[PDB]
Amino acid sequence: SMSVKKPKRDDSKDLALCSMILTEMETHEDAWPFLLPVNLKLVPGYKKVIKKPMDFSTIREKLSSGQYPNLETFALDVRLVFDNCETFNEDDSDIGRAGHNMRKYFEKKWTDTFK
């Protein structure tokens, strides 16, 4: 509350550390469904169904241009990429499996870097 603060967690490396996590997600062999925005002209249903499209290239641009106010807003966009994937793709598909794999990979890097 006013004039009453928890001890100050060092957040000065968070930008760099989120950038490294993102590089590792970009270079995973199962990243291919997530590297670029879904083409809304060429994928029937996507525009209407997925209210908030997100992909790695869009996170990378937001990161590089100071559009994440803190590391939690960054995690929310990464998770949004996989939540969208689950909404639109069957579990038993290459893309559906890719998303489960990448979400796992992300959550481990996230815990090991920050928790």
Output the furthest CA–CA distance in the chain (Å, rounded).
54
CATH number of the domain encompassing residue 79: 1.20.920.10
Residue indicated by tokens 């481990």: 108
Whole-angstrom Cα distance, residue 36 to residue 49?
A: 18
52 and 80 in contact (C-beta within 8 Å)? Answer: yes
- Which DSSP symbol is given to 50? -
Tokens representing 86 are 């689950």
Whole-angstrom Cα distance, residue 79 to residue 76?
A: 5
Handedness of CA 59, 96, 53, 72 (dihedral sign): negative
31 and 56 in contact (C-beta within 8 Å)? Answer: yes
Measured CA angle at 98 (ends 63, 77), to 5 deg: 25
The experimental method behind these coordinates is: X-ray
Question: What is the extent of the structural domain holding 72?
Answer: 1-115
- Our count of domains for the chain comes to 1
- Helix locations, 13-93, DSSP H: 14-27, 46-49, 56-64, 71-88
